[PDB]
Every structure is written in C-alpha cells, then in structure tokens.
Amino acid sequence: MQNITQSWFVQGMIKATTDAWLKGWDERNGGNLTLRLDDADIAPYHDNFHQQPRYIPLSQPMPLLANTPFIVTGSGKFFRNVQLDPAANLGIVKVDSDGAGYHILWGLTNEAVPTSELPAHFLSHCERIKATNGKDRVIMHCHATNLIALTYVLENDTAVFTRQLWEGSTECLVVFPDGVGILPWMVPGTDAIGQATAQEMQKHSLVLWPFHGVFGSGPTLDETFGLIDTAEKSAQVLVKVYSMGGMGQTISAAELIALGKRFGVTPLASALAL
Amino acid sequence: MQNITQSWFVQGMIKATTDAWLKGWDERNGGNLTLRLDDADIAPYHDNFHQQPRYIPLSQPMPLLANTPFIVTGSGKFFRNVQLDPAANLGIVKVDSDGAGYHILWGLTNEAVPTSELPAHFLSHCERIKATNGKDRVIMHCHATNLIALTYVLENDTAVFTRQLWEGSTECLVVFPDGVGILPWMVPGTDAIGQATAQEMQKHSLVLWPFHGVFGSGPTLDETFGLIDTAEKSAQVLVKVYSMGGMGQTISAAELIALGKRFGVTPLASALAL
Amino acid sequence: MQNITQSWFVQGMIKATTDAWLKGWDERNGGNLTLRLDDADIAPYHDNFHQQPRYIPLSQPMPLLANTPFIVTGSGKFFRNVQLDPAANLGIVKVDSDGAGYHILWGLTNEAVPTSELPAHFLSHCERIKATNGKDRVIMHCHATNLIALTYVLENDTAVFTRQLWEGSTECLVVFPDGVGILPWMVPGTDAIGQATAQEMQKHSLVLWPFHGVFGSGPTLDETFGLIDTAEKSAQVLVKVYSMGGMGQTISAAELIALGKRFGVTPLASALAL
Amino acid sequence: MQNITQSWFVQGMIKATTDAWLKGWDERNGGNLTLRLDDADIAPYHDNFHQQPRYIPLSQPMPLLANTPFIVTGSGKFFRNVQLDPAANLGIVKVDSDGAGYHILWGLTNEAVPTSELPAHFLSHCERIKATNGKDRVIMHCHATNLIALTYVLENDTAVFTRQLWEGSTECLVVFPDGVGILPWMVPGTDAIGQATAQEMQKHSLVLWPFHGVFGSGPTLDETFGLIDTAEKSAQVLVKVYSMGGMGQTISAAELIALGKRFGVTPLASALAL
Ligand SMILES: [Zn+2]
Ligand SMILES: [Zn+2]
Ligand SMILES: [Zn+2]
Ligand SMILES: [Zn+2]
Ligand SMILES: [Zn+2]
Ligand SMILES: [Zn+2]
Ligand SMILES: [Zn+2]
Ligand SMILES: [Zn+2]
C-alpha cells in the first residue's frame, strides 16, 4: 500500500539498520545510512509527505546532487529504534535544484535532522556516482567491531589492511578487489573527514576510520551491507587468529591472483605486491 | 490505551531490560533499572493501580524524592522475564511526602519488592537530580561483560579506566566526557555501596563496580542504555585489542582534545593528562 | 486453556530450551532437561494424554520417584526444535508405583524416548530431593561454552574451579555458595556417569563434566537456568581475562567472606581456603 | 496447504538458512544449501510450478542424478533473505533424464540460477548417495567462523584437525567418527573444487575448505546443520582454549576409544593414532 512505511525503501532502511544493530555495530547513535532514490520511488507517496517540508542548507554546494531524493538516518537517532518508529528516525530529503540544500519531505519528526555525517555521505555519493557511472546508491557507516579492533593493531595502511582482509576470508578479494582505503584518525562530523572519505571512495568501496568504524558504498542496501559484513567477517576471523598467536598459514599471493583471474577482478596492486 | 502495560514507561522498561538481557548483561537477576516519572505520567492509569498499595520504608530518609513516582525492577526478578510479565517483574512506586518510604501502586505482584540495590538507585537519583538540575531520570545497573572483564586487568582508577575507554571508540569522549568513576569492590545491596555510588555520580554519569558491573545515569532510558552500550562497546574493542597483544596505535591525547573542542565538551582533566 | 502445550510447564520447557539454544549451549541434540511435576499439574490435561501410553523400564529401580510425573526432553532431539513441535521433542512421563519404569503419557511422538542421560537426571533428582527436602525440581544439562573451555585450562578440582568462578562475577558465591562439583571425564549416557553426577549433586547444585558440559539443579526452571547462566557468565568473563593475560586483581578471600556473611550463605570451605 | 512456501522442504530450507545467518556463518551470499527431494515431495505442488520451467545444463553429466528433484539456494543470494522471499532466493530444480541439465520448476525468480557451488553440491550428493546407500540427502556449505579461524593455525591435515575437533567437545567423535576431510586451498566455484570435495565426501561427512569454510552431508537438514554446528561448537571451544594459551588437559586417546566403543562407532584410525 501507499503507506510509505511499507515502501521498499523504508522497509529496506529498517532491515539494514536493524540488522546492523543486531550485529553489535551500532551502539547508541553510532552509524548512519543514506540511500539515493529516484523521483519515481517517492512520487506515489506524495500524500504521505509533510504538508510543510522543512528546508536545511547543505554544508557546501553539491550541484551533482541537484533534485535528488534520499532516505537518510537522523542525527542522534539509534539504529535500534528505526524499526519502532521509522518516521522519527529516518527522513526522506530532496536536494534542491542548485544543490545548496534540501527539503525534508517525510520523517525526521520533532525537529530531527539528517545524520551529522551528511558531508561524508553526500560527498561520497557524489564521488561514487562518478566512479561507478551512477550505479552506487548507498553509503553506510557503522562501528564494525572487529574492523575497529584491527585498527589498533594492524598498520593503518591501505595495502597492508587490504591484504590482511583478503587473507581472512576467501571471498574478500572478489567482494572488494579495489581494497579498503584507510584515513588517518580525524574529527568526525566535519567536512574535512567527509571530503577525505569521499576522496578515498574514488578508489575504494570501503573506507576505514581508525578507532571509529567503516564506510561502505554499493548499488543496493543489501550489497552495501553485505560488503561491510564481508570485511567485518574477515576481521572477526583475523581477530581470532591473532588472538591465537597469528597465522601458521594463509591465502598466498599466488592464490589471490588465481582467485582474481577466475572471478574477472583486478586486485589492488599494492595489496597484491605484499 | 489506558492499559498501563502499553504506557510509554512500561513499554520503555520492557525494551531496556529485554535489550540488556539480549546483550548478555543480565544473567539471572543480575542488574536493576529505575526510572523517575512525573505524576502526569501515571495519573491516567490510576484505575490500573492496586486497590490496596503496599507500603515499604526506605533504607534512610530521602526527602528530595518526596512524592516522586518511579518505575523499578523487582528484587530477584530476571530481566529476561520483564517482557513476559511486566506486572510480576516491575513496579510503580511513589515515595511518600516525607521521603521515608513508598507505596507500591502497581506491579510487584505476589509480594515482590523493588530491587535490592534501591539504595544505590535512589541515592544516585538524588545526586544526579542535583548534578543535572533535574534532567537525569534513569539509573541503570547491568553486568556489562567486557567492562567487568576489564576490571580484572586495568588499573581500577578513574583516570586510567576513563582514558582507555575513550581510546577504545572515538565517540566515547563525547558520550562520557566526565569519564567513568570506579569504586573499590564493595558488598552489593548495602547503603555503603549505594552512597559510594551516589557520591561518584556527583562527578560521573558512569560508575564501575569492580568484578561486578556498571551503573549509568541519564535523562531517558535510551540515553542511559546507550551510555552503557557505548562504554561496553569500547570495552569489547579493548578486550579484543588486549587479547591480540595490545595497542600498536591509539587515539592520542591531542586527538581527544580536538574531539572535545569540536563537540563542546570538557574532558575529565585527569584522564586527559595521561 | 487445557491445550497442554499452553500449560505453564510445557511453556516453561519451551522457554528454557529455546533460551539455551540461543545462548549457543545446545548444538544438535546437546543438552537435556527434566522437570519434576505434581499430579495436580498434569491432571487437568488427561484428555491430552496419549490414549495408549508407552511403557519403558528405568535403568535401575528408583523407588523414591514412584508415581512421580516429569516433563523431559527427548533423546536425539534438538533444543532448537522444542518451540516448533513440543510434542515431538518433549514428553510427560510418569514413573510407575515401584519406580521400575515409566509411562509416556504425552509427547515423544514417533517412537521417541526420554534423554539418553535419564540416569544422570533421575538419579540426580533423587539426591537433590533428599538434599533439599524436596525443594529442587529441575535438572538441566547443557554445553555451556565458556565453562567447557575452562575445563581444558583450569585444574579440574572442585575447590580451584569454584574459587575461580566465584572470582569471575560478584554474585557467584551467593548463587552457588556450595560451589561446583567436577567429575573426571566419563563416558556419557551411562549409569556410571549418572550416579557419579548424582553423588556430586549431594554436595553441589552444579556439576561439571570436563570437555563436555554442566549439570545444574534448582527449584524452578528459571532458578536452574539462572544458576547455569551465572556460572557460564563468570566463565565468559574468566575466558576474556585469561585471554588478556590473566588477573591483575580479583575478588579477595576476605571479600568473598564478607559477601557470604552479608547474604547469609556458607561458602564452600575448600574453595575459600585457597 | 498446497502453498509450496509452507511445504516441509521450503520451510526446512528457510529454517536452515535463517539459523545459519543468525550464527554469523553466512555473510553476504556466503554459503549454499541443497536438499535432494523425492517426486512425491513436489508432486502435490505442481500447480505452484513455473508454467515455463527454465533449462540449465549441468557442468558435466551426472547420470546418477537423472530425474532427481532438489531444492537449492540461488547464486549470489543471501541466506538472510531466504525467509523474506523464498521464491527469489531458493529454487526447485529437477535434473533431466540423462543427468545433463535441469529444469527450474519453482523459484529462482528474476533470472536467478542455482548456487555457483552446484558442482561441489551435486558431485558430493552423488558420492554421498553411493557412500550411504542413498541415506544422505543434504549438502550444506557455510562460512563457520571458528572452523575458518582454525584453518590458519592448525595443521591442515585430516588426522590432526579431526583429532583436535574430537577433543574440543565430547560428542564430536560420536557425531563425526569418520572425521573431517581437509582440502588444500582451491579456487571456489570450479569443478576442480567440486570433485575434490566430492572425493573427500567418500570418506568423511565434513570437508574443510581452508580460509573459506566447511561442507557437511547428512540425511536431513537438521542432521546436516547439527553436524556442522557440532564441529563449529568444538572449534569455538578450541579457539577460546588456544587463546588462553592452549590445553592443560584434554580428552585422551583412551577416552576417545572408550567413547567409540560405547556408541558403536569406528573412529578414524589416523586421528586416533595421534
Ligand atoms: Zn561513527
Ligand atoms: Zn502532494
Ligand atoms: Zn549487580
Ligand atoms: Zn484510582
Ligand atoms: Zn551433553
Ligand atoms: Zn483421561
Ligand atoms: Zn563459500
Ligand atoms: Zn502442473
């Protein structure tokens, strides 16, 4: 039905945030999720829209996103609560014709606003649109526990971290052959960290924020969730292995190459060279 | 409806205790939770109140709580069971006009009584009311697994423990800039441990009971739950990192300072100085 | 209603087995649970009983259990499935007037039989009835993960293991002041292991089977489940602490004594003396 | 009802994949599951079949499977989603009269195809049919976390790995007396890895794919799931024990022998000889 809460995208946002909550990745208001929609997705639900949509400026002009609708998680909102009250915890926003701000068409009730990591999200969407010719539609951030733990013990280096994650589950090279970008620790909720993330997103579908968490990009909620879940699963395996004293054996470079060849992916050169 | 079990506060108590049970923080009757209400919250439900409310004296006079209603978990009751029978496992109590005792207006059926940690709860409520000008409304105690584990291995010192928890997830300094108070081990269920906790609550929103668990205070169930969840998430990360041999790198003092500045919080000086 | 599946005891058996499944304690058919009932419990449901109750001899005469009804889990049945088909996975049995065998009054459909650990259960029930003047009504066995892990690393000694478990969560001494009996490894499903367990049950409410699991006894399903959950929670804490390099500090003997005094329990002397 | 989604086998596939998802064994599209059916199982549901069943060739002729129906998971489909849309994520396929290909009778909607590990599944089904005189009906693959972790630290040797898993939970020798076959790392989704797996399946009901996961075979979904769950539980125990510094004591060869004798199983000689 044209009850917007039963739409594919609201249901999808509930599923993703709820699943991430259950994984233990999103304590308190940790994490944020944005999904780029088409006008066609939200048009049937216009009757559900706020009669008086609030306007909020963006942090900087984002003309590439002009007229683009998104569904987003709210600032300070808990992933745990999305399923209980989607309208309180999520919003549908539509960027205005000059990419200078957006209207909140639905949700974010009681003066709520989009995620404080909106710069990281929207700037990353922009770079991912360019990088994938508009295929990618989702940016997801969560506090993936084992990935976080690894940032205290592994070299915070794209090649090293990528190579370890590839080694920690066979599928990883196939799921993220472009590897995992790593930033230095940076203050969250800033345009600095947002553009730095967006820059890494030019080269990688996953970006790590040391001592904090991960960002993932992909074409759908499931693909993006599954991308992060894959990297976090590998991280979980690695944490066990390291806790047991380290690898006695592992996936070799030659094996990774053979895997890349079979699946028609080009593995990140730097990570492979290790 | 004026079915009191469907009230925001009974539903909130069910959500919090159930979530804590699922987290593995509340084996058996471990843990307790009290929420300060307004008369306005319970007034519509007077028809639901016991016809003959039982009276129980408090451990000591608490005049600051005179005429104040609370919803509380019962002594020896299991968090796991709250969702199955809220009236058996929870009670609404109203402190009398002199703060010498309370009436059990609803729940705690079959001669049940409030939590044996009522001194810790109510005395902490008193100090938190003073410390936050009446903003804080919740005291929550649970057996947060990783926090407990850390009390056997980290120095049981407010500065040291706070600093480590801040390091273990970026959000921590922002969520608890006042840090985490630590008591010596003390016998549970006593007014000694209750006042000692209340005293720490003057300076901190989180207090650790070594080899036992944690107390948290906050304005709402979600904020208080989320506070503990944040500290426990950091603890979980730390336990992994320590199990892997310790930190190769971490969040620096300079980073913590920058984080504090950005979020307009004053980090506990002692923890920052380390 | 007189639908026996909605009885307190069938519902209780479902809750306990399901909770244990979710805890990860009961892979495959691992674990078994028996609850001693009164005639008064099952009498209203006689219409639900098999028209033709099957008779099975006991392994040895158990005259103390003459005419006693129990609800039990089935041999080779999965805890995971109890909630899906209680009649397939559980049975109500009534021991005959000489304690030589029992009739299967309800459940254990398709030729199912009670748990292969029936000797351990019924013999333990006998000793616990004697030891607690008929208060205890439940024997529960599960493959409590951390408790199992500890049996490979701690001395398999009642005093040592008890003392460590007491140290691993403050509540433990209060919950099991009589401590935890430990057997040598023995072949499961035998009367040898059953009587050995029953003998330990004379002195302890918890008994460990090294490299296998735990048995607990108590007056109700919740109290027995909670007993095991408490010991397993302490074990979980200990496994973390040991994985981090061991205790830097812990609950002292003097603290345990003070705790025992406050709660009016007599802690196992041998464990305290360590 | 003749709603095929409510059939025992569709419900069973949902239960197994959902349970495996909840165990954390099947991130993204990790894992695959195939169940051999009888014509009698699917015949009542012919009205539910695609009007126009798609035909797909097999990788190689499999005449032993001629005319045999299976229910299978789809390639790139998520275990997490099976419960949400069984027809999207599962299919019923029937191998043609020469074993050269199959028709997709139901499910795998929107051009979906069976699992990319179909060679491993069907070739293993063939060997297991031969090895168990048609008793085995299920092949299940998942990314069992602790089993995976162990492949980085234990010798990737059938005898060594089997013996350790037997030691890690008492039931293991009884559940898999034939032990656990181990392959070298191989490229997934190939007929090479499929036949290599099928060859190991001649001698073992469990086969490990280092740095990747496990395959299990059994007569029913529950028995096969429970087989993997048992091995993974033992692995979980072992990972804890190894993280704590290793075994101080364990199940002895003499104990394993006694266990084998009692349960009438012949333990894998090589593993016992260690
Ligand atoms: Zn974050
Ligand atoms: Zn409109
Ligand atoms: Zn407590
Ligand atoms: Zn009234
Ligand atoms: Zn057992
Ligand atoms: Zn009758
Ligand atoms: Zn796989
Ligand atoms: Zn037809």
Short mmCIF file of N, CA and C in Angstrom, two decimals, chain B residues 52-159:
data_model
loop_
_atom_site.label_atom_id
_atom_site.label_comp_id
_atom_site.label_asym_id
_atom_site.label_seq_id
_atom_site.Cartn_x
_atom_site.Cartn_y
_atom_site.Cartn_z
N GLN B 52 -5.13 -1.69 46.92
CA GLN B 52 -4.51 -1.60 48.25
C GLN B 52 -2.99 -1.53 48.17
N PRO B 53 -2.43 -0.36 47.80
CA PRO B 53 -0.97 -0.24 47.63
C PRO B 53 -0.18 -0.52 48.91
N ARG B 54 0.79 -1.43 48.81
CA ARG B 54 1.65 -1.82 49.93
C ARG B 54 2.63 -0.70 50.25
N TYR B 55 2.98 -0.57 51.53
CA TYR B 55 3.94 0.45 51.93
C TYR B 55 5.24 -0.19 52.37
N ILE B 56 6.36 0.32 51.88
CA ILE B 56 7.66 -0.17 52.34
C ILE B 56 8.53 1.03 52.72
N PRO B 57 9.15 0.99 53.92
CA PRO B 57 10.07 2.05 54.30
C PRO B 57 11.29 2.05 53.40
N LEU B 58 11.86 3.23 53.20
CA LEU B 58 13.18 3.34 52.57
C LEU B 58 14.26 3.02 53.60
N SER B 59 15.47 2.73 53.10
CA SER B 59 16.60 2.42 53.97
C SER B 59 17.00 3.61 54.86
N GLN B 60 16.79 4.81 54.35
CA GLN B 60 17.06 6.04 55.08
C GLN B 60 16.16 7.11 54.48
N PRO B 61 15.95 8.22 55.20
CA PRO B 61 15.12 9.29 54.65
C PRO B 61 15.73 9.86 53.38
N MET B 62 14.88 10.09 52.38
CA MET B 62 15.29 10.69 51.12
C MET B 62 14.30 11.79 50.74
N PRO B 63 14.28 12.89 51.53
CA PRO B 63 13.28 13.95 51.37
C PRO B 63 13.27 14.59 49.99
N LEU B 64 14.40 14.57 49.29
CA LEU B 64 14.46 15.14 47.95
C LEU B 64 13.52 14.39 47.00
N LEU B 65 13.29 13.12 47.29
CA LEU B 65 12.40 12.30 46.47
C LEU B 65 10.95 12.30 46.94
N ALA B 66 10.60 13.16 47.89
CA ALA B 66 9.23 13.18 48.41
C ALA B 66 8.20 13.28 47.29
N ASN B 67 7.16 12.45 47.36
CA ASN B 67 6.04 12.48 46.39
C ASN B 67 6.41 12.09 44.97
N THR B 68 7.60 11.53 44.79
CA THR B 68 8.10 11.21 43.46
C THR B 68 7.77 9.77 43.06
N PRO B 69 7.13 9.59 41.88
CA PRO B 69 6.89 8.25 41.36
C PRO B 69 8.06 7.71 40.54
N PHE B 70 8.28 6.40 40.65
CA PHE B 70 9.29 5.69 39.87
C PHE B 70 8.70 4.40 39.32
N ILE B 71 9.26 3.93 38.21
CA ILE B 71 9.04 2.55 37.82
C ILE B 71 10.37 1.83 37.99
N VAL B 72 10.31 0.66 38.61
CA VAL B 72 11.50 -0.03 39.07
C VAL B 72 11.43 -1.51 38.75
N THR B 73 12.59 -2.14 38.65
CA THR B 73 12.63 -3.59 38.55
C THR B 73 12.59 -4.21 39.94
N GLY B 74 12.07 -5.42 40.02
CA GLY B 74 11.90 -6.10 41.31
C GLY B 74 13.13 -6.88 41.76
N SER B 75 13.25 -7.07 43.07
CA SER B 75 14.36 -7.83 43.63
C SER B 75 14.24 -9.31 43.27
N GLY B 76 15.33 -9.86 42.73
CA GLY B 76 15.38 -11.27 42.36
C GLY B 76 14.66 -11.57 41.05
N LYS B 77 14.13 -10.53 40.42
CA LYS B 77 13.44 -10.71 39.14
C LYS B 77 14.44 -10.73 38.00
N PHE B 78 14.11 -11.44 36.93
CA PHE B 78 15.01 -11.62 35.79
C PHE B 78 14.66 -10.62 34.70
N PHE B 79 15.66 -9.90 34.19
CA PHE B 79 15.43 -9.01 33.03
C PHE B 79 14.75 -9.77 31.90
N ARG B 80 15.12 -11.04 31.74
CA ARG B 80 14.59 -11.88 30.66
C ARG B 80 13.06 -11.99 30.71
N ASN B 81 12.50 -11.91 31.91
CA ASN B 81 11.09 -12.17 32.13
C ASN B 81 10.20 -10.93 32.07
N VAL B 82 10.82 -9.75 32.05
CA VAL B 82 10.04 -8.49 32.13
C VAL B 82 9.01 -8.42 31.00
N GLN B 83 9.45 -8.75 29.79
CA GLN B 83 8.57 -8.78 28.63
C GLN B 83 7.43 -9.80 28.75
N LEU B 84 7.62 -10.85 29.55
CA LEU B 84 6.62 -11.91 29.67
C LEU B 84 5.54 -11.56 30.67
N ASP B 85 5.92 -10.82 31.70
CA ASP B 85 5.00 -10.46 32.78
C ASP B 85 5.49 -9.18 33.45
N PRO B 86 5.20 -8.03 32.81
CA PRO B 86 5.68 -6.76 33.35
C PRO B 86 5.23 -6.51 34.79
N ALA B 87 3.99 -6.86 35.13
CA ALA B 87 3.46 -6.64 36.48
C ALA B 87 4.15 -7.49 37.56
N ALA B 88 4.62 -8.68 37.18
CA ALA B 88 5.36 -9.53 38.12
C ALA B 88 6.76 -9.01 38.40
N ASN B 89 7.36 -8.36 37.41
CA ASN B 89 8.79 -8.06 37.43
C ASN B 89 9.14 -6.59 37.61
N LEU B 90 8.15 -5.73 37.43
CA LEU B 90 8.31 -4.30 37.57
C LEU B 90 7.29 -3.80 38.57
N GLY B 91 7.57 -2.64 39.13
CA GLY B 91 6.57 -1.97 39.96
C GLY B 91 6.61 -0.48 39.75
N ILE B 92 5.47 0.17 39.96
CA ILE B 92 5.44 1.61 40.07
C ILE B 92 5.32 1.92 41.55
N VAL B 93 6.28 2.69 42.05
CA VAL B 93 6.31 3.08 43.45
C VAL B 93 6.21 4.59 43.54
N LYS B 94 5.63 5.09 44.62
CA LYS B 94 5.58 6.52 44.82
C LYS B 94 6.07 6.79 46.22
N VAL B 95 7.16 7.53 46.29
CA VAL B 95 7.76 7.91 47.56
C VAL B 95 6.78 8.81 48.31
N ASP B 96 6.62 8.57 49.61
CA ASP B 96 5.68 9.34 50.43
C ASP B 96 6.15 10.79 50.67
N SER B 97 5.29 11.60 51.29
CA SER B 97 5.51 13.05 51.41
C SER B 97 6.73 13.46 52.27
N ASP B 98 7.26 12.53 53.05
CA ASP B 98 8.44 12.83 53.85
C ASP B 98 9.70 12.11 53.37
N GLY B 99 9.56 11.34 52.28
CA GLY B 99 10.69 10.60 51.73
C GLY B 99 11.18 9.49 52.65
N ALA B 100 10.29 8.99 53.50
CA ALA B 100 10.63 7.94 54.47
C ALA B 100 10.32 6.53 53.95
N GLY B 101 9.48 6.45 52.92
CA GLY B 101 9.08 5.18 52.34
C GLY B 101 8.27 5.40 51.08
N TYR B 102 7.74 4.33 50.52
CA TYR B 102 6.98 4.44 49.29
C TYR B 102 5.81 3.47 49.28
N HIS B 103 4.80 3.78 48.47
CA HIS B 103 3.72 2.85 48.19
C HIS B 103 3.96 2.18 46.86
N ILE B 104 3.65 0.89 46.79
CA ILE B 104 3.71 0.15 45.53
C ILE B 104 2.34 0.26 44.88
N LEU B 105 2.23 1.16 43.91
CA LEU B 105 0.95 1.48 43.29
C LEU B 105 0.52 0.43 42.26
N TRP B 106 1.49 -0.15 41.57
CA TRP B 106 1.20 -1.12 40.51
C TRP B 106 2.33 -2.12 40.43
N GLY B 107 2.00 -3.36 40.11
CA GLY B 107 3.04 -4.36 39.84
C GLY B 107 3.65 -4.91 41.11
N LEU B 108 4.85 -5.48 40.97
CA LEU B 108 5.50 -6.27 42.01
C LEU B 108 4.50 -7.21 42.71
N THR B 109 3.78 -7.97 41.88
CA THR B 109 2.75 -8.90 42.33
C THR B 109 3.38 -10.04 43.14
N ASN B 110 2.54 -10.78 43.87
CA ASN B 110 2.99 -11.90 44.71
C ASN B 110 4.10 -11.53 45.70
N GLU B 111 3.89 -10.41 46.38
CA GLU B 111 4.77 -9.94 47.47
C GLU B 111 6.18 -9.55 47.03
N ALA B 112 6.36 -9.27 45.74
CA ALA B 112 7.67 -8.81 45.25
C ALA B 112 7.99 -7.41 45.80
N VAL B 113 9.28 -7.09 45.84
CA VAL B 113 9.72 -5.78 46.33
C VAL B 113 10.69 -5.17 45.32
N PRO B 114 10.92 -3.84 45.40
CA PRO B 114 11.91 -3.26 44.48
C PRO B 114 13.29 -3.88 44.65
N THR B 115 14.10 -3.69 43.62
CA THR B 115 15.49 -4.10 43.61
C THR B 115 16.22 -3.92 44.94
N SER B 116 17.02 -4.92 45.31
CA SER B 116 17.88 -4.85 46.50
C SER B 116 18.94 -3.75 46.42
N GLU B 117 19.13 -3.18 45.23
CA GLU B 117 20.04 -2.04 45.03
C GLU B 117 19.28 -0.72 45.04
N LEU B 118 18.09 -0.73 45.63
CA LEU B 118 17.34 0.51 45.75
C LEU B 118 18.14 1.66 46.40
N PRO B 119 18.94 1.39 47.47
CA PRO B 119 19.76 2.49 47.98
C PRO B 119 20.67 3.09 46.91
N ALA B 120 21.41 2.25 46.17
CA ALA B 120 22.26 2.74 45.08
C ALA B 120 21.43 3.54 44.07
N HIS B 121 20.26 3.04 43.70
CA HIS B 121 19.41 3.74 42.72
C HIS B 121 18.89 5.07 43.22
N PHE B 122 18.15 5.05 44.32
CA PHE B 122 17.52 6.27 44.80
C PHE B 122 18.54 7.32 45.26
N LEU B 123 19.61 6.89 45.93
CA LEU B 123 20.62 7.87 46.35
C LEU B 123 21.32 8.48 45.14
N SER B 124 21.55 7.66 44.12
CA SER B 124 22.13 8.15 42.87
C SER B 124 21.18 9.09 42.15
N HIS B 125 19.89 8.74 42.10
CA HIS B 125 18.88 9.67 41.55
C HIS B 125 18.97 11.02 42.25
N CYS B 126 19.09 11.01 43.58
CA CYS B 126 19.17 12.26 44.33
C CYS B 126 20.37 13.10 43.87
N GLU B 127 21.55 12.48 43.81
CA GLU B 127 22.76 13.21 43.40
C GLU B 127 22.71 13.67 41.95
N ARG B 128 22.16 12.82 41.08
CA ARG B 128 22.03 13.17 39.66
C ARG B 128 21.00 14.28 39.42
N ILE B 129 19.92 14.29 40.20
CA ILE B 129 18.96 15.40 40.15
C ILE B 129 19.70 16.71 40.48
N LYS B 130 20.49 16.69 41.55
CA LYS B 130 21.26 17.88 41.95
C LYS B 130 22.28 18.26 40.89
N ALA B 131 23.00 17.26 40.38
CA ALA B 131 24.11 17.49 39.44
C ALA B 131 23.68 17.97 38.05
N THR B 132 22.46 17.62 37.64
CA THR B 132 21.98 17.92 36.28
C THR B 132 20.74 18.80 36.30
N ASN B 133 20.48 19.42 37.45
CA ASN B 133 19.28 20.25 37.63
C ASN B 133 18.00 19.52 37.19
N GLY B 134 17.86 18.28 37.64
CA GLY B 134 16.64 17.51 37.40
C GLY B 134 16.48 16.90 36.01
N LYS B 135 17.52 16.99 35.18
CA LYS B 135 17.48 16.43 33.82
C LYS B 135 17.52 14.90 33.83
N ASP B 136 18.44 14.34 34.61
CA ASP B 136 18.59 12.88 34.66
C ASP B 136 17.40 12.26 35.35
N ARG B 137 16.94 11.13 34.81
CA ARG B 137 15.75 10.45 35.28
C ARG B 137 15.90 8.94 35.42
N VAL B 138 17.07 8.42 35.04
CA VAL B 138 17.24 6.96 34.95
C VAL B 138 18.54 6.56 35.62
N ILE B 139 18.47 5.51 36.43
CA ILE B 139 19.67 4.82 36.87
C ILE B 139 19.57 3.39 36.40
N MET B 140 20.61 2.92 35.72
CA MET B 140 20.61 1.57 35.20
C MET B 140 21.87 0.86 35.64
N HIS B 141 21.70 -0.37 36.13
CA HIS B 141 22.82 -1.23 36.52
C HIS B 141 22.74 -2.53 35.74
N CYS B 142 23.85 -2.92 35.12
CA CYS B 142 23.90 -4.23 34.49
C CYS B 142 25.30 -4.81 34.62
N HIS B 143 25.40 -6.07 34.24
CA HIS B 143 26.65 -6.80 34.33
C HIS B 143 27.29 -6.84 32.95
N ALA B 144 27.72 -5.65 32.52
CA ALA B 144 28.30 -5.45 31.19
C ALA B 144 29.61 -6.22 31.10
N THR B 145 29.58 -7.25 30.26
CA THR B 145 30.56 -8.33 30.27
C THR B 145 32.00 -7.84 30.11
N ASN B 146 32.25 -7.05 29.07
CA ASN B 146 33.62 -6.62 28.80
C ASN B 146 34.12 -5.61 29.79
N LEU B 147 33.24 -4.71 30.21
CA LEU B 147 33.59 -3.79 31.31
C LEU B 147 34.00 -4.57 32.55
N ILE B 148 33.23 -5.60 32.90
CA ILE B 148 33.59 -6.46 34.04
C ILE B 148 34.98 -7.08 33.82
N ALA B 149 35.19 -7.67 32.64
CA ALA B 149 36.49 -8.31 32.36
C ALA B 149 37.63 -7.32 32.54
N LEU B 150 37.44 -6.10 32.06
CA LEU B 150 38.49 -5.09 32.16
C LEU B 150 38.85 -4.74 33.61
N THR B 151 37.88 -4.84 34.52
CA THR B 151 38.19 -4.53 35.93
C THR B 151 39.22 -5.51 36.56
N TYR B 152 39.45 -6.67 35.94
CA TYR B 152 40.49 -7.61 36.42
C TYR B 152 41.86 -7.32 35.87
N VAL B 153 41.92 -6.49 34.83
CA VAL B 153 43.19 -6.30 34.12
C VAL B 153 43.70 -4.86 34.04
N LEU B 154 42.79 -3.88 34.05
CA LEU B 154 43.19 -2.48 34.06
C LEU B 154 43.26 -1.97 35.48
N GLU B 155 44.08 -0.95 35.70
CA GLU B 155 44.12 -0.28 37.00
C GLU B 155 42.73 0.24 37.33
N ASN B 156 42.25 -0.10 38.52
CA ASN B 156 40.92 0.34 38.93
C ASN B 156 41.01 1.79 39.42
N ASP B 157 41.21 2.67 38.44
CA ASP B 157 41.45 4.08 38.67
C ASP B 157 40.63 4.86 37.65
N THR B 158 39.91 5.86 38.13
CA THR B 158 39.05 6.68 37.28
C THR B 158 39.77 7.24 36.04
N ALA B 159 40.94 7.84 36.24
CA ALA B 159 41.68 8.43 35.13
C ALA B 159 42.10 7.38 34.10
#
